[PDB]
Amino acid sequence: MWHYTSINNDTRVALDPKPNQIRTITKPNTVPQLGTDYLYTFNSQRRSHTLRLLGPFQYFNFSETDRGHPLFRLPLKYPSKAIPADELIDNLHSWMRSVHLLHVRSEDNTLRYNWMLGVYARSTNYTTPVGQLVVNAPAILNYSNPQDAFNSVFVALGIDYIDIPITNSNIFDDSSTPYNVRIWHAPTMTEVNHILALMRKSTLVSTHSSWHWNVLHTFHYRSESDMIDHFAAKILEDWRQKEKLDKGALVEADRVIQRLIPLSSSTYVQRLAAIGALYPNEFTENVLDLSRLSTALLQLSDTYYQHANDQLRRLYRRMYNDSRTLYMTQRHQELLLAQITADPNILLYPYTYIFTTIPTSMNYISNTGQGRIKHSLTVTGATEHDTVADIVLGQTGEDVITISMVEPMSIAVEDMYGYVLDTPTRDIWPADEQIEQKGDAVALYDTKTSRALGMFNNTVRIDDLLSPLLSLVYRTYIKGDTMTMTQGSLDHLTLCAAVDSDITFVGNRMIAPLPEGYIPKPMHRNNSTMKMLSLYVALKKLENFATNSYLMAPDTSIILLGAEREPAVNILRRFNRNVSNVRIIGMGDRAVEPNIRVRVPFPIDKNISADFIICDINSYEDQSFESMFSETISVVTTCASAATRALVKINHPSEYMINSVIERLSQLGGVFYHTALLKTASQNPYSYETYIYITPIAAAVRFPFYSNSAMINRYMTAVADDEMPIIPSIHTVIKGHSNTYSPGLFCGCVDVQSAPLALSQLKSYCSEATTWRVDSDDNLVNIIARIDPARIALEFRTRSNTSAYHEYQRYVPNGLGFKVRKTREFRYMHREVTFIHKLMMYALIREQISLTENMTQVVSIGGRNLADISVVPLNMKYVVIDPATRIETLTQEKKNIEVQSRPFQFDAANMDLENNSIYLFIAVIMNEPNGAATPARMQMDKIRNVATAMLTRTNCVAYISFYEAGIITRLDQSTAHKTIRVEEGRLKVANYVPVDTLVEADVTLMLRDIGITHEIIRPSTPELIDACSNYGIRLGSTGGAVLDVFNHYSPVIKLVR
Amino acid sequence: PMSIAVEDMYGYVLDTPTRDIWPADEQIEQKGDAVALYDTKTSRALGMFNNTVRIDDLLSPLLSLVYRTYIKGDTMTMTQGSLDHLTLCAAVDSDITFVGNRMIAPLPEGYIPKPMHRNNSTMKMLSLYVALKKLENFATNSYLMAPDTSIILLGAEREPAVNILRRFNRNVSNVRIIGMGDRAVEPNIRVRVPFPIDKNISADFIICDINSYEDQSFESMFSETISVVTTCASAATRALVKINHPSEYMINSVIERLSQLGGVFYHTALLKTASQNPYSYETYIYITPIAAAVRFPFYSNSAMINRYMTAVADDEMPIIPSIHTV
Amino acid sequence: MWHYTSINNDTRVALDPKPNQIRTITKPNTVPQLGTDYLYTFNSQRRSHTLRLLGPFQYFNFSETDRGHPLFRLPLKYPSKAIPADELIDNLHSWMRSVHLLHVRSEDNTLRYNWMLGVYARSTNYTTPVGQLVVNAPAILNYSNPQDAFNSVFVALGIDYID
Amino acid sequence: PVEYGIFVQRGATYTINAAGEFEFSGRNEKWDQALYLSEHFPALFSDVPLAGANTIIAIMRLFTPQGFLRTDDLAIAANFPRASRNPQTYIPYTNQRGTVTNEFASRFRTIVATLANVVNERAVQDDMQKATRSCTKQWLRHLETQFDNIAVAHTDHLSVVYATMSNFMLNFTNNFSGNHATFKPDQYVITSPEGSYKPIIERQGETVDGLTIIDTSIVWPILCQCTYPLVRQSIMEEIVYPDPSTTLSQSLSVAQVLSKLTLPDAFINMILSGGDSVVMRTYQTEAD
Amino acid sequence: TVTNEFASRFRTIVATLANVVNERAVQDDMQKATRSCTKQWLRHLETQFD
Amino acid sequence: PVEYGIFVQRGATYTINAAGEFEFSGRNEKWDQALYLSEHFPALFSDVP
């Protein structure tokens, strides 16, 4: 694999036809075809038509009579649409028929036409001395030995050389030629040594290391810029060739060193050649913007010289001084010795300098194509920044990047219609309990809910999340892209909600095509509209479970109370336009017709009635607690007396409020109603305003009352705020290893040279940080970074400031990205519900870990790749016992970490519990290390053994998470099975096997028979506000729906001694 | 260039382990063969063939023909999730809508989509995805991702694979398709091996395809590939990690490592995709825990391994096809 | 919940691009798109064509040479049917390519182009004293601190204000 | 007006960056000759295609030269003075002995094809009578044939005179590479450390007995009232080949006069070349 | 400017006015010569304004 | 103009405190020779960078 292997051959001599072929090489009979005769592309954005001919024709100088042909006039038939094949094909057939090369057919088997000379002869209408030489003796063009082909012309003309102009490979660019080739008399190597030595005295001239037909030729440039672009394209060719030559693959390329030698040139060329011969670039299959190439490579010289060790630097300087030298790797020269041994007559550029050493330097990344980089920065590296200067990110325009308040949802259409109920648990409601909860209600009401929870409630508004999804449903409709969905299906309801017009159906499966003359206006939804739709879906899905069509039953009716319910009634009415006799009434104050406008309490004479009632009445706000209590009571009373099935919103869901509600329904009906506290997925994610489903059933409702229900806990654990909520700041300066920063972001731009340092400093605070350049022209790199508390809780365990800065140096300048288009980041990014749950759990644990005294260390079993670390204070030692945490002992030693990469043993005898240590057991009991589910009895064995080991030690606190069984019966009833879903009775977290669930009473039973003190605890709303504000994460909508049930039903056990 | 059926390109061929135990002397005897085969490189002839008949050049005329029939409107019928659909997703750089489950949405009248841009390792990653859906269950006709499930594709330049995969699964709800690896443009995360210690990637599936750093100690490639398989297995129930240097010692130390991490043995098998380069010895290893204990966990003299082992230092420079005339 | 909470910021200073961006903010290469580059609606009943440009272009005083462009002649191709996207898109692409703001590119990371002043300068064919001030010294449009951006123009022109 | 609008809005002039791409002014502004020495070029002569103003681009593409870039071979053989490292000159037209039709006359005829359609467009837009149109059209055909007549005397007989004149000893600077879009003459100066430099080339306002003022109207007599030896219709006047000795002897006379001219000043400047001096404190750093 | 904005606007004014007078002429069956004359007088004013 | 704006922002004039340090006005004002006999100096000749 070490030696280079290649089948070198002159492709240009190969391209030249035998003389008899010349009459037919124009193919007068057959029509030219793409992918063979030619290829043409319309670069749609640049509005340019590039036509490259193929085969022998690919090198061709057009006669001015050739340019008078229509085929070249074709681009001017446009802008802009691509030339239809049929016009192009036949016009090309016409001009190809037009060309009649002079030649002499011959029966000898060794002759080949001198394609270049004959084409150049014809191109000048044969008035050049080489042209008339072709005319009087066309047989001269024929040749066997490739070199003598031009020799016979030189001797016949008595001239020292010939200058051939070169056409653009694109044949639609009638523009000035960059340069022109000059074939030289040569033929002995010595004549070449002379021609080059003399060539040093000229101006803008360059040669390849080896020449086609074994005849020396030198390019001569009209201007230094044309030279720069040529040298660039060829440096790139030599790199792309070397990249596979080093991989040992066979290479059929024409010459071993495709790089040009600057026989005479400007400084920029000498430097381009010097940096070009060093092969700095890493192999890259990504498409390059070939147009900006020179600039790119010059920037690369500008970087290579800027950061190379002094000996490499001096080597590039030597290279830059002996520009007429051809520097080359030893393997290259070995290949040359091979081809000289094979063909002794061959000419090669003589003035080479072999590299005894291939230089030791990092390969540079280079993707000149579109795409912002999203670096996943590592906490530690080779470089040690003893003290770094502050980096000031120059402020960004919104033209280059915007920052919205909240990330819009990206979700499936079915997901938005996804309710998640909570059934009542307690069997009775003793009179003292009512007082004890009444005080909590009067207090929570008179002293309002947290400003942070309320701000989040009113910041991530659901309409803004849903809108891009609902808007996309609309745009596919009006352009006719949609045409198939079942009637009554949720996608149909979504179409009714995305367009303000009737939806006819030519058949049950096919949508009626949009009438040709018009485009319907987008549907107008208020923020509470989609929630009302999801409550309707919840009602049809609670009336019966298996239903596919959410259409109203015939001869049935429904009412929608509450302000501004008009869009809901419109989408509902038009959704049910097909079903016969479907009344859909509307009600509420501020309600335009069709909706009745009425105020709460409803007028005493009025007697509303339906099969269904989606009450959604808002609180009047400015009132006594006695007032909101009596008002909501009468609202539920009226909502229940009229409908067999109901779904009334509760603005202030105190345990006392809801239990007094069930007490009221029992007071009215005798037999208890079957209530459940629903929470729609289309409802605002942070809203605590849960709904209560209500329906009488023939069976008596055992356990009618709620207590400690998750829907209620969303409202109860919310309390008066201690301080004003954190507002996502966007700081620009990057201090090195400085702890102080607000939650938020790190937007800015900085010069590409100081860019690696920027990421080398940025790593201290940010788990990842996207970076890009507007263009190859731009000297700056735009940079965005979220500030994650976990990484800050990792990098700040010690004063050490290691970083992968040396690797980041390779990305400069082209390895950092490019994106002319705007990017829109968000002050609040989306994340999955389970990750947020782990954040609330880590906050619930971390804010207790601070209050405790004496315990030196945190042993977090199951803390994969230090996920648990945000819990741990910077002074504390941290130990992980996960047989999946990869070990770098340098990082263990660096951040005061210790990691035992063995499975933790749950047996009581071998357990190594210790005094004054905090044992974290977060979601580890549920799974074996390989990922197989642990049976519930085995989990009981795990908690039993851990409490048993904990009985015999001081200052030990354990936090063992467990999924409760009671969630299953919840999730089986609810539709929002996204991410968290029941399967075979086992709860399934995303990216996990379903895991069997423990019973809580059994857990407290084993924990009380063990006799150890214990506290069931679950993260609360303040924890949610803490995590979502601190990380910059925003709640998902379906995630917001599922999150309360998911959180209350995975309690953490807190053992303590 | 290859001339082949579209289904043929998605065609993995595994090799299950045979030996029931791994005695300590055998590890030394294979360790010498590994250190020797690594420090003294593989044959220049096998490597030249490995790098001459590149798979992209073979596949291209087939993949290009799939494209040309599309833009002229000649194609219009294929089932969703079918391998021909994946091939269309791989032959065209645009979204593929379906007016029905059987009928392709007609190309919009005003435009022709640009040809899809594949790097040489793209099609191999696609075939490994097909291998994963076909190893998760055998009879499947649609290779679409299951709803509310995710997958990650480690390794440099995995972008075209993630694009074709994402657009292939545009219809299925909630289908995350993450990307990773050094030199990786967005959507793909750019990260270097070893993965950062804080980072905690996770999915139902992991098609690892990490390349060797080449300029390193054998101890280095051993520890690095070991940590790569460790991370690749801890995150996914099902995995398909590439082994650049499949010595019997390497792979058996890999199974030894998985037993060292999980207790119970993983059900490994050495897969080799049909869309992989024909001469490459870089076989993949499928990895999945099972409730049953894995009897005969270890490999020896397996064909996938023999492709690498019987390769040795070349005696002479490989024959290069001359074209003589007389 | 009682105290007001807000992230106040000057949206107009935010809208202004860095100077290197100015050559490409006209986007000569890429075709403009609805919902981003612009939004246009045909109020079918009023038979009126409302076209609002977006981004930095949303605040722009057209030169009388700019009004001579076909893109502004588009509503008069009608009444009444809404302008087909393809005519509007490309005409907008033409006029957007037509605008060449004077500026000086700079490697500093803190500069932003004075979008308003440069657009107003161009709009009068640079015969206003602020306009010729932009012509002889385009680098003056560049600024870091938002306030001094207009100050440097006031001091340079010796004038008490600008309309 | 619309074509000109888009045009002049692109910029009246442009420069060439180190990248080599043209960058336009974006700013209407009359050209003045001072600009000729700078990095600027006039925009009409740029030949960068511009959308919506293609007609101006075509008419400007009527201005592209038909000649070629001859190497000043004989002058180099004779070692005549030459400021360029590779002397070259642009001949206005190639010789075309063989063809049935002069390529030069053909191109001029296509030029009058374009120009005639431009004048017909302009006439119909401006409601002109058909007769006056017939008259301009006929005058145009007339020029086309007159050009067809003199085209030989140019391509075949003036071209040689431009080539031998290209070789003369005194024509030392390069004049034109034949590419209008990127041409800029090399600008040597006589720099001095002890003074301001003197450009060899500047707008000094020495019109040289009126020589530097250019009457383009000279094309009219040349096309339409001057016979050439090569075009008899056929007297066959014998061609004159001038004795080299006359132009040679005046060239040489100019040269010797020039050297002998510089001589006395150049001698004293050599004597005093070391005489320029700088004031210099010498601080002492030793006891003695 | 290379061109007075005032003269430019007057020229577009005479563009509109000239097309209005050509419309009026062709509707009223006028001879082409008298049309050439009004059109020429219009161009004449355009340059005088210039 | 820009360099001008910075300079005049420093002040068109200055005094010289007992330390000898210059103290610029921060203010633009037209000079008058009424100032020649006072503490103030034209700032253009401060020769302070």
Ligand SMILES: C[S@@+](CC[C@H](N)C(=O)[O-])C[C@H]1O[C@@H](n2cnc3c(N)ncnc32)[C@H](O)[C@@H]1O
């Ligand atoms: C729940 S998972 C990691 C998720 C973790 N909560 C986090 O924040 O990233 C727990 C990990 O601990 C390891 N593990 C599982 N069971 C274990 C056990 N019984 N003893 C020690 N480690 C175990 C597994 O490798 C598993 O990946």
